Amino acid sequence: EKTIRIGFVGSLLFGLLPRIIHLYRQAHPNLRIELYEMGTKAQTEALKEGRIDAGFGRLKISDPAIKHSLLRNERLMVAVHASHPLNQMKDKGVHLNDLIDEKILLYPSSPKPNFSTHVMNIFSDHGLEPTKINEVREVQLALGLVAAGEGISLVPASTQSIQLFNLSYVPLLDPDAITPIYIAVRNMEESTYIYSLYETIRQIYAYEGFTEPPNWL
Amino acid sequence: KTIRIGFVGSLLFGLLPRIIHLYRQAHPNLRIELYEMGTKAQTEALKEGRIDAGFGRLKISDPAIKHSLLRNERLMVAVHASHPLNQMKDKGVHLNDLIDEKILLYPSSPKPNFSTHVMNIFSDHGLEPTKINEVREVQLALGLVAAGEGISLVPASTQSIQLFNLSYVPLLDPDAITPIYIAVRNMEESTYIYSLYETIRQIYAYEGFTEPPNW
Numbered sequence A: 001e002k003t004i005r006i007g008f009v010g011s012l013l014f015g016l017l018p019r020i021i022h023l024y025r026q027a028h029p030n031l032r033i034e035l036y037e038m039g040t041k042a043q044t045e046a047l048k049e050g051r052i053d054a055g056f057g058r059l060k061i062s063d064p065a066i067k068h069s070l071l072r073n074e075r076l077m078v079a080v081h082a083s084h085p086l087n088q089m090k091d092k093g094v095h096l097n098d099l100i101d102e103k104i105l106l107y108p109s110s111p112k113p114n115f116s117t118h119v120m121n122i123f124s125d126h127g128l129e130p131t132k133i134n135e136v137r138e139v140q141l142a143l144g145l146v147a148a149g150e151g152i153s154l155v156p157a158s159t160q161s162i163q164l165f166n167l168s169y170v171p172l173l174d175p176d177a178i179t180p181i182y183i184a185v186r187n188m189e190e191s192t193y194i195y196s197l198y199e200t201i202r203q204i205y206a207y208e209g210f211t212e213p214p215n216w217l
Numbered sequence B: 001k002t003i004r005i006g007f008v009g010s011l012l013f014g015l016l017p018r019i020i021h022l023y024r025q026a027h028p029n030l031r032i033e034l035y036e037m038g039t040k041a042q043t044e045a046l047k048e049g050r051i052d053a054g055f056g057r058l059k060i061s062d063p064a065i066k067h068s069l070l071r072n073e074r075l076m077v078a079v080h081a082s083h084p085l086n087q088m089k090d091k092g093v094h095l096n097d098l099i100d101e102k103i104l105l106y107p108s109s110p111k112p113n114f115s116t117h118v119m120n121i122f123s124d125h126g127l128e129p130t131k132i133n134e135v136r137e138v139q140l141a142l143g144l145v146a147a148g149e150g151i152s153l154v155p156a157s158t159q160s161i162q163l164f165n166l167s168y169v170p171l172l173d174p175d176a177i178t179p180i181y182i183a184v185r186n187m188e189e190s191t192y193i194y195s196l197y198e199t200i201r202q203i204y205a206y207e208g209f210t211e212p213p214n215w
């Protein structure tokens, strides 16, 4: 009875993480896999304290006691109501500077830095100042509120797992309108079980046709 | 000209957003404030005047509050594509087929909540799930199911979320359903609330659903 504990940001369950876990489980039938939802920031102390062994997060927070590998970047999209003018560009995409005067829903509401830190930074990076920002608890809430007419939201491509009536996802074309997925571990040599997790990630990414790959070590 | 609406978050996967949007369009001078909260919290929020209408998954009887059952949603079983239960997707399964499986209950908010009704419908027929685990919200349950951890009972509107190798299987028990309520203060007579009711009626009519009662 050996155990690996994995922390993850909840919204990563809309992407490739469940496939990664499922394959990892098939490869390690004797392994107990414990899954703990937590924000990226929370994963730092969880790793240092040994409450988790690896953390899937959406940014890199530097702490000397942990280390990181960039798995991949997801494209950001603009979630809009179907009646919004922006939806006419659904098949071609828009840019950050098209969004400045819109009501933007940011998320999550957990301690900073979090997903939304980078979102605001990419605006600032090009001298853009969004004039109307609201923070909500998590992405699926933001999406439901967009469908209800509450504004727009910048969301990872993976959230297209959620399809709602009159909700549309519009591509964001700025090359830096992307959001990273990181794996974080203690700053020491990975265990055999963590190395196996890396290989499982590599395998799922190979199925998706991603190239790096990814990268790794 | 401000209306405050409380809602259970998972209701945003069904008809509620299109109801709110149609309602909003018809009231350009109305400020709509939307508050995510469990059904238990809506009851106190209504009595305390913090919201004007609450959309919930259950009825908490209180003399200060009046409820209207909008409709019942079918419950479905979320399973991994490879799960034996997914071989009965066309015909459906019954609650008594689920009893030996690891069932993911949710949410972890204060009780009573959606998981209360789910466990009650088993209890109502002398069925006791042998393996249960409570998770925070529906998307955690769904992701864990897709990851191979267990199964979950969910409202049919959950099918708005489609994950790789996640399948939804109909339940056949007539009472394997989950209600959607609107709750308002007992002496509520606001024109904006009347309009909200009528907007629900319009959307339901378009969907071919039964027309909700009083009002």
Ligand SMILES: [Cl-]
Binding pocket: A011, A107, A108, A137, A138, A139, A140
């Ligand atoms: Cl989120």
